[PDB]
């Protein structure tokens, strides 16, 4: 829900998810689901928004109805905030486990130092079960296992209660008098000299003793017990491994692209060179969370979100396969209602009018190339 | 005229109670505001209260206050509860929307986002006001005591969340495991603005200089809204507007 | 009578309508309430904005017309009993404004808050927004308007003039409305995450500062009361 | 600034008028005076005028930038007539990047930044009207120094 | 690249202008690379000679609507014709309100005990008039502007 | 005769001079005028630069000095016509003040905006520089002191004592004159680029407040001016 | 002694000084010693460190008992 709201040319030009997968669609309480997939660092990274200096791979959930048990970026735990590299592509893998009973719409986004939130495609997961049933465990260093649901909680409830009930007495025992007119008046006419006085000192003495001596029994028996801490554990982790992907076979140069105003597709020309030795054919392009796929070349599989996926909203106008070595130049059509329901439709609103997207080239034998798109996007309107 | 003593008390005890009501309320939004866009982001999570940036800033930004209702209460009814009032009223307004919206709305737990403790230091800030009434001593010793007894005061309720534990590889506290697990998606873990470590820190000086610069600079917080507070206080009525 | 239960109604009303409002945003604020551009949001949402918009317009404009009608001219020719009862009415009303300012400030501020570091923000009109900014802050607006004119037109003590406090604890939590839009400036241009501690996101914090001036009005308002009712019993 | 660009920008120099016209304020400033004069109270003037003052001047400057804004496709890129404009007649000592205009945010919703920043000039247009008042009422003053 | 670009340190680009004479006379064409926090870097430079009239110059350009405007003069007479607009109902305004004595009068007015008669009936007449009439011209001016010009980016 | 036809004079001069100058510098701001470093730019603008330093120079020495001697002693034996007479000088003066203040700081100085938009700067003495800040400021510098001391020698109001206001209005675009070189270190070391809403360049900004103090003398003008011709006609 | 009270994280990962050589243990006055070596600027540089973008190679003595005559990074002074 956080998307369809963020800037259209920001979305499609900042990071792009794909080989998502989600290992189960309805799980149990105290059950784990599992996040998969790659996103390549565009190369484009947008001025406005600060480089993924410090960046940190959360998931879009609406507040904890799944804790993130693990969450890896190449295959190295990611607790805390990491490095990206623009135009490097990197594959994450997530681990969540259920804590709240519903439909909940699981997304997955790369937070940045000075650019916010940067949402990806999100799943709807089901949740069956009772909230009572979650567990947390945790073993220590210290040899002791605890539950966070309710670990420290009742020291903390306690410890507030307390204090709160100290302040409480405080106010209560200087408005046991009168408060407020009589006193100023007091104050006002001449000399006052008699509001306080013993034993109220004695009793402010006492309450500053109480209060010293309680802080400082309390340090004491909070090290006697627990005698051993660390300091919040933090700092950006650098040196993530990207992932090696071979360089791509199939160059695209872009000429022109075009969206109807108003209108559901987009129009786009592309001029394709095949290197390599296998005849390929354009099966999908993913602009932006959208996966515009051509039913007759490439299929999904991975249970991608429906409102994502258009299974026939990718049409060439020459989708014959493409020998080795030779050029030429097709018009590639994007048409589905998600580009409008996302509203990328609205870039027309939007300072910088560019695009960015994925192009999957698929051959007789399978295997599959990722090659990127970027060109200025020109709006039409007759 | 009032007709008799006996009423005329019960007059004064029933505006003590309202304005009291009024004067309470009116803190609690006002006060809450200001340290909901001053110390929040670090009240709000465990992992978010470290030992270097938190232990700075919560003092510094939230003696505000506290040093104006002090320097209209005290000096004017000779009420010593300014800042114990204003304590209060803070630890109410976090406390309830911490149950019924950060645990009732939402389902963070209370051990994960429980609020600051700060009575302690209201403690002592009023006491030190009352005794020996010099708001220039209270401005020193007391806003000392205000900014050096906040950590260790916090101590008992954040201790239990510093265990270390070894989490999938990586040394880890409770707290950051806590943080780790229950996801806030508008927090991400970057803006954790907490000590990561310098090159001139000395083993275990980032608590106790925290904690002296805190002190110092709810000095100058106190000196300086004091002042405010008595300009705030005044009874002027304007001819025209 | 002195002192009569409109103090119970004031209070009750408010609890009464925001605890409904409370519940009526916790069941509404998923499903329906999360999206922004969802057509099932307009019609949960943006109506609500409008009507609540539309009816505290309304509730103001009668309100200080009414109050403003019913001035008493003859203000030197009061009985000290009366002035005491109109000092009392007046106290209610600010017990009135104190409980919609601590409402419009700390649950519903602190609370968009919280719906904040739960999803990522999507409109200038959230709901969260709609119930906070856009009703609490109108409710605290009427009310502290209101008792600056009951006590302008009812109180000799206020009259002879406008109170400087007085009318800063009446602004500055109404200036809270002109600046609800000031830091989502400094946001679609300036701080581009989410905090509360940020530099645009304090114009609600130097003008939170604005209703300490709670303190000059008490004290002028006691002032008031200790008029011809000081005693005989206090100073003695 | 009339006389300035029209005798030295366009005189001088030979900046195109339709590129190099300055801003329109007299509907701000009417509304400011006559709210000032109406209701003469300062702090009136201050809130209501000064939110006028911040929220007519984008909307009163609109049929004078409205032209200047239909798209173009101008050699592959979308541009504004502004900006073919701006690229076309070269200003030597002000660089294109210098240009400090929106250029879009994750957290900008679709038509919001035309009226959000509105609203955030018109309060900081408050703060800056209850400023200078004070700055004005002690630069008005009538004092004598007996010694400089 | 009408925008500002990203270049890297060490890398060599080659780049092309295409300029269109616009006044005759013999002028130092140079070449920068204008830097964020550096400033201009000025190039080498030539002499070029333009010869004609700056009259017959032309800068035609199509719009996405449909429309073949010259950029000479598009949008000049909108321009100059609205800031003439608005700078006149300002001046009446002034002329309006300094038809009558100003300065020493009204201070000696304002001065010497309660004025109270150097704005009255008519003058908030003519000022809620200005007020709204300002307001209506406002609204009624951005409408025609979006029913004309319907498409704007 | 009260107020002759000085003020025509005041206009005159100073718009035939500054046209002149605009048509100068309109034929040679290119064409020996747009290298800092060419021989031409030398014998065209540094030489200019110079006698415009040493003529401004001397004709604040001869002003002050002639205005200074000239004080009238007798000021108490004043009659009221002359008194008058000499308010109407004093006000001519403070047209010409306001007439350089306007071609110093906004004809020249918005000049300079554009010469710098054309171009790029290339030394601190740049010929829309010489025109300006070199010529233009001392020129309104020296009318300022001119009614300065014209109002202290020849008005009893403005004597006993020094008006704040006032020395305020003539003291701030002065200041603007130390500041010519303020920015000018804010460049060579601060902004490498050619902006206006710069940081270092507000020492003209915070200073172009300082002649707001021109309300301040208008108002103590008028008070002198009605000292004795308040009427009668006036208050009435 | 400066070293000893840097945090131990930072220490340990900043920059790794190895293959140190010291030209001479004790000289007399008006005498050259020469220390060489080379440091691998660590990967994982913290981010609370800046990056070594403006580095200078100092040389760690209590006061000018030495002078640096020269100092070379590479084979440039
Ligand atoms: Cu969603
Ligand atoms: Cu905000
Ligand atoms: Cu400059
Ligand atoms: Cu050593």
Same mark, same amino acid.
């Given at each position: 829900?956080?998307?369809?709201?963020?800037?259209?040319?920001?979305?499609?030009?900042?990071?792009?998810?794909?080989?998502?997968?989600?290992?189960?669609?309805?799980?149990?309480?105290?059950?784990?689901?599992?996040?998969?997939?790659?996103?390549?660092?565009?190369?484009?990274?947008?001025?406005?928004?600060?480089?993924?200096?410090?960046?940190?791979?959360?998931?879009?959930?609406?507040?904890?109805?799944?804790?993130?048990?693990?969450?890896?970026?190449?295959?190295?735990?990611?607790?805390?905030?990491?490095?990206?590299?623009?135009?490097?592509?990197?594959?994450?893998?997530?681990?969540?486990?259920?804590?709240?009973?519903?439909?909940?719409?699981?997304?997955?986004?790369?937070?940045?130092?000075?650019?916010?939130?940067?949402?990806?495609?999100?799943?709807?997961?089901?949740?069956?079960?009772?909230?009572?049933?979650?567990?947390?465990?945790?073993?220590?260093?210290?040899?002791?296992?605890?539950?966070?649901?309710?670990?420290?909680?009742?020291?903390?409830?306690?410890?507030?209660?307390?204090?709160?009930?100290?302040?409480?007495?405080?106010?209560?025992?200087?408005?046991?008098?009168?408060?407020?007119?009589?006193?100023?008046?007091?104050?006002?006419?001449?000399?006052?000299?008699?509001?306080?006085?013993?034993?109220?000192?004695?009793?402010?003495?006492?309450?500053?003793?109480?209060?010293?001596?309680?802080?400082?029994?309390?340090?004491?028996?909070?090290?006697?017990?627990?005698?051993?801490?660390?300091?919040?554990?933090?700092?950006?982790?650098?040196?993530?491994?990207?992932?090696?992907?071979?360089?791509?076979?199939?160059?695209?140069?872009?000429? =022109?692209?075009?969206?109807?105003?108003?209108?559901?597709?987009?129009?786009?020309?592309?001029?394709?060179?095949?290197?390599?030795?296998?005849?390929?054919?354009?099966?999908?392009?993913?602009?932006?969370?959208?996966?515009?796929?051509?039913?007759?070349?490439?299929?999904?599989?991975?249970?991608?979100?429906?409102?994502?996926?258009?299974?026939?909203?990718?049409?060439?106008? =020459?989708?014959?396969?493409?020998?080795?070595?030779?050029?030429?130049?097709?018009?590639?059509?994007?048409?589905?209602?998600?580009?409008?329901?996302?509203?990328?439709?609205?870039?027309?609103?939007?300072?910088?009018?560019?695009?960015?997207?994925?192009?999957?080239?698929?051959?007789?034998?399978?295997?599959?190339?990722?090659?990127?798109? =970027?060109?200025?996007?020109?709006?039409?309107?007759? | 005229?009032?007709?008799?003593?006996?009423?005329?008390?019960?007059?004064?005890?029933?505006?003590?109670?309202?304005?009291?009501?009024?004067?309470?309320?009116?803190?609690?939004?006002?006060?809450?505001?200001?340290?909901?866009?001053?110390?929040?982001?670090?009240?709000?999570?465990?992992?978010?209260?470290?030992?270097?940036?938190?232990?700075?800033?919560?003092?510094?930004?939230?003696?505000?206050?506290?040093?104006?209702?002090?320097?209209?209460?005290?000096?004017?009814?000779?009420?010593?509860?300014?800042?114990?009032?204003?304590?209060?009223?803070?630890?109410?307004?976090?406390?309830?929307?911490?149950?019924?919206?950060?645990?009732?709305?939402?389902?963070?737990?209370?051990?994960?986002?429980?609020?600051?403790?700060?009575?302690?230091?209201?403690?002592?800030?009023?006491?030190?006001?009352?005794?020996?009434?010099?708001?220039?001593?209270?401005?020193?010793?007391?806003?000392?005591?205000?900014?050096?007894?906040?950590?260790?005061?916090?101590?008992?309720?954040?201790?239990?969340?510093?265990?270390?534990?070894?989490?999938?590889?990586?040394?880890?506290?409770?707290?950051?495991?806590?943080?780790?697990?229950?996801?806030?998606?508008?927090?991400?873990?970057?803006?954790?603005?907490?000590?990561?470590?310098?090159?001139?820190?000395?083993?275990?000086?980032?608590?106790?200089?925290?904690?002296?610069?805190?002190?110092?600079?709810?000095?100058?917080?106190?000196?300086?809204?004091?002042?405010?507070?008595?300009?705030?206080?005044?009874?002027?009525?304007?001819?025209?507007? | 009578?002195?002192?009569?239960?409109?103090?119970?109604?004031?209070?009750?009303?408010?609890?009464?309508?925001?605890?409904?409002?409370?519940?009526?945003?916790?069941?509404?604020?998923?499903?329906?309430?999360?999206?922004?551009?969802?057509?099932?949001?307009?019609?949960?949402?943006?109506?609500?904005?409008?009507?609540?918009?539309?009816?505290?317009?309304?509730?103001?404009?009668?309100?200080?017309?009414?109050?403003?009608?019913?001035?008493?001219?003859?203000?030197?020719?009061?009985?000290?009993?009366?002035?005491?009862?109109?000092?009392?009415?007046?106290?209610?009303?600010?017990?009135?404004?104190?409980?919609?300012?601590?409402?419009?400030?700390?649950?519903?501020?602190?609370?968009?808050?919280?719906?904040?570091?739960?999803?990522?923000?999507?409109?200038?009109?959230?709901?969260?927004?709609?119930?906070?900014?856009?009703?609490?802050?109108?409710?605290?607006?009427?009310?502290?308007?209101?008792?600056?004119?009951?006590?302008?037109?009812?109180?000799?003590?206020?009259?002879?003039?406008?109170?400087?406090?007085?009318?800063?604890?009446?602004?500055?939590?109404?200036?809270?409305?002109?600046?609800?839009?000031?830091?989502?400036?400094?946001?679609?241009?300036?701080?581009?995450?989410?905090?509360?501690?940020?530099?645009?996101?304090?114009?609600?914090?130097?003008?939170?500062?604005?209703?300490?001036?709670?303190?000059?009005?008490?004290?002028?308002?006691?002032?008031?009361?200790?008029?011809?009712?000081?005693?005989?019993?206090?100073?003695?």
């Amino acid at each position: 829900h956080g998307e369809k709201s963020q800037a259209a040319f920001m979305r499609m030009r900042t990071i792009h998810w794909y080989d998502l997968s989600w290992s189960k669609e309805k799980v149990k309480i105290n059950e784990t689901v599992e996040i998969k997939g790659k996103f390549h660092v565009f190369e484009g990274w947008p001025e406005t928004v600060d480089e993924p200096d410090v960046a940190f791979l959360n998931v879009g959930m609406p507040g904890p109805v799944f804790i993130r048990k693990e969450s890896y970026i190449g295959g190295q735990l990611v607790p805390r905030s990491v490095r990206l590299e623009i135009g490097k592509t990197y594959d994450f893998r997530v681990v969540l486990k259920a804590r709240r009973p519903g439909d909940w719409h699981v997304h997955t986004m790369m937070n940045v130092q000075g650019g916010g939130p940067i949402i990806g495609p999100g799943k709807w997961i089901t949740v069956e079960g009772s909230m009572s049933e979650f567990r947390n465990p945790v073993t220590t260093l210290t040899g002791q296992t605890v539950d966070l649901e309710n670990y420290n909680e009742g020291n903390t409830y306690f410890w507030h209660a307390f204090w709160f009930a100290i302040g409480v007495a405080w106010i209560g025992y200087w408005s046991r008098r009168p408060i407020f007119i009589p006193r100023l008046l007091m104050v006002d006419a001449g000399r006052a000299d008699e509001l306080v006085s013993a034993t109220d000192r004695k009793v402010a003495m006492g309450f500053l003793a109480a209060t010293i001596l309680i802080v400082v029994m309390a340090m004491s028996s909070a090290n006697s017990k627990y005698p051993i801490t660390i300091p919040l554990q933090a700092g950006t982790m650098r040196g993530m491994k990207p992932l090696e992907l071979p360089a791509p076979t199939v160059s695209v140069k872009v000429e =022109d692209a075009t969206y109807r105003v108003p209108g559901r597709a987009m129009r786009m020309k592309l001029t394709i060179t095949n290197h390599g030795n296998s005849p390929i054919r354009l099966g999908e392009f993913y602009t932006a969370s959208v996966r515009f796929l051509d039913s007759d070349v490439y299929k999904d599989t991975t249970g991608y979100p429906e409102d994502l996926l258009a299974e026939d909203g990718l049409s060439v106008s =020459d989708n014959s396969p493409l020998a080795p070595g030779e050029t030429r130049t097709v018009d590639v059509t994007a048409s589905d209602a998600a580009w409008e329901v996302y509203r990328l439709s609205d870039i027309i609103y939007d300072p910088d009018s560019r695009f960015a997207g994925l192009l999957f080239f698929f051959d007789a034998t399978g295997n599959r190339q990722v090659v990127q798109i =970027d060109a200025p996007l020109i709006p039409s309107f007759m | 005229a009032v007709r008799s003593h006996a009423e005329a008390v019960q007059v004064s005890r029933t505006i003590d109670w309202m304005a009291l009501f009024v004067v309470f309320f009116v803190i609690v939004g006002s006060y809450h505001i200001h340290a909901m866009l001053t110390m929040g982001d670090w009240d709000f999570w465990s992992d978010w209260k470290d030992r270097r940036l938190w232990v700075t800033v919560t003092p510094i930004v939230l003696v505000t206050f506290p040093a104006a209702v002090q320097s209209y209460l005290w000096e004017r009814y000779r009420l010593p509860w300014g800042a114990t009032v204003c304590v209060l009223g803070l630890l109410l307004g976090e406390w309830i929307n911490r149950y019924f919206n950060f645990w009732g709305w939402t389902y963070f737990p209370i051990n994960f986002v429980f609020p600051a403790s700060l009575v302690p230091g209201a403690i002592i800030l009023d006491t030190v006001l009352m005794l020996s009434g010099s708001y220039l001593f209270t401005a020193i010793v007391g806003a000392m005591g205000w900014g050096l007894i906040f950590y260790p005061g916090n101590w008992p309720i954040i201790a239990p969340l510093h265990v270390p534990v070894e989490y999938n590889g990586m040394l880890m506290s409770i707290a950051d495991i806590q943080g780790y697990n229950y996801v806030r998606t508008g927090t991400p873990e970057y803006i954790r603005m907490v000590e990561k470590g310098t090159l001139r820190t000395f083993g275990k000086d980032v608590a106790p200089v925290s904690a002296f610069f805190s002190a110092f600079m709810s000095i100058l917080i106190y000196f300086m809204w004091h002042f405010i507070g008595r300009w705030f206080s005044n009874e002027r009525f304007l001819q025209s507007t | 009578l002195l002192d009569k239960k409109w103090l119970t109604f004031a209070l009750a009303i408010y609890t009464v309508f925001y605890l409904w409002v409370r519940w009526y945003e916790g069941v509404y604020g998923w499903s329906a309430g999360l999206d922004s551009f969802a057509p099932e949001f307009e019609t949960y949402w943006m109506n609500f904005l409008y009507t609540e918009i539309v009816l505290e317009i309304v509730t103001a404009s009668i309100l200080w017309g009414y109050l403003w009608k019913t001035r008493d001219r003859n203000l030197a020719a009061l009985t000290p009993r009366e002035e005491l009862r109109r000092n009392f009415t007046h106290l209610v009303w600010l017990v009135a404004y104190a409980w919609a300012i601590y409402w419009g400030a700390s649950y519903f501020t602190e609370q968009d808050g919280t719906w904040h570091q739960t999803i990522v923000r999507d409109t200038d009109f959230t709901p969260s927004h709609i119930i906070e900014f856009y009703l609490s802050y109108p409710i605290y607006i009427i009310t502290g308007f209101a008792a600056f004119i009951y006590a302008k037109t009812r109180l000799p003590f206020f009259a002879k003039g406008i109170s400087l406090p007085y009318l800063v604890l009446v602004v500055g939590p109404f200036m809270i409305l002109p600046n609800v839009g000031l830091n989502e400036w400094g946001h679609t241009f300036w701080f581009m995450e989410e905090l509360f501690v940020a530099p645009l996101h304090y114009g609600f914090v130097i003008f939170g500062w604005l209703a300490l001036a709670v303190m000059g009005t008490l004290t002028q308002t006691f002032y008031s009361f200790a008029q011809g009712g000081l005693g005989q019993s206090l100073c003695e």
